[PDB]
Amino acid sequence: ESFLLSKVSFVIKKIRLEKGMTQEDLAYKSNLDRTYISGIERNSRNLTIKSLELIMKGLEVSDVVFFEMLIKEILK
Amino acid sequence: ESFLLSKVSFVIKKIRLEKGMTQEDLAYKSNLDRTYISGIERNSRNLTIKSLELIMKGLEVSDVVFFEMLIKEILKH
Amino acid sequence: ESFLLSKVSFVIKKIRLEKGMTQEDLAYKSNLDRTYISGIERNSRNLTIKSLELIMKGLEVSDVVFFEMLIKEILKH
Amino acid sequence: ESFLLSKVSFVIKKIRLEKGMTQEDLAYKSNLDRTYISGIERNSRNLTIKSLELIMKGLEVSDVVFFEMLIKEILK
DNA sequence: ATGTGACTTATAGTCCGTGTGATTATAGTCAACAT
DNA sequence: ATGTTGACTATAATCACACGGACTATAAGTCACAT
């Protein structure tokens, strides 16, 4: 697998938790499948930008805040 | 179509020109098709994080500084 | 246009496919642009003997062999 | 220079002679410039196929006869 | 007759990119059953 | 609640090709002057 893809997934999970969201709720809020979300967080999916974008909207987080976080997570 | 995509595709081109690369060098170095690099810049196209990573390696740029330029482009008026 | 050209054009393609090459491979080994190889096959362009020679070397074929197939294609019905 | 180019030129000169033509006359007959022809025969020109075709018309020699000859010439 | 040289102008050949049908690999989406 | 296994189907990604515009190298065509 990929380093970036792992950090992306980790970040998605991180933000979901600091917001006290469940996966079920993250999937409802972004209209995607819960098993889809699950899959990403267990790093079994290689998402596209479009999908990533839907997940950010579901997390209620701006692109910028996401990447700010993704950068920080990337640096150990 | 997608907000972030045209930002990603814009930044891939920006860097590519900054580094005085041509499309088909980058297509080689990124270990993706000739026409895919074109298609990404040309229209936008919906790439995969793995493909984006390949391109970053190809732009000879780090994940970090890519995303830093990504943020800057998003923030523009 | 020109009689001999489209024949030369035809034979370059024929050989190229007989050898399972692609235009990309060919323009590769002929050290010409892939645009030019396309241009030749497409619209029978007016190449120079030197360029033809490069293409022969690219097709991994000899002067002789080429011209022998050239003669054949000219003679056909 | 090129090997092929020299033998094309040699052939052009060979045929012009076997026929008894001057350069002046090969130029007239093919509607090309005499210095143009002189250049080719000293092999100071890299013809295009089109030009070669005009010289064949001037020599009154079919493509086939020209190439049959060029081949033979090519093999020392 | 032929052979130079040198000087325009057409075009051969280069270089970077666009746009496209067809095929292959794979993400997108949604089942059934788990815990 | 979340995890996992197959699935089906959309589409990401590949591969071979056509096509254009702009630029550079050089062949095409014509002088003058040799011999």
TrEMBL record, chains A, D:
Transmembrane segments: none annotated. GO terms for molecular function: DNA binding; DNA-binding transcription factor activity. Residues 12-67 form the HTH cro/C1-type domain. It comes from Enterobacter sp. RFL1396. The lineage of its organism: Bacteria, Pseudomonadati, Pseudomonadota, Gammaproteobacteria, Enterobacterales. Keywords: DNA-binding, Plasmid, Transcription, Transcription regulation. GO terms for cellular component: cytosol. This is Regulatory protein. The keyword DNA-binding applies. The gene is esp1396IC.
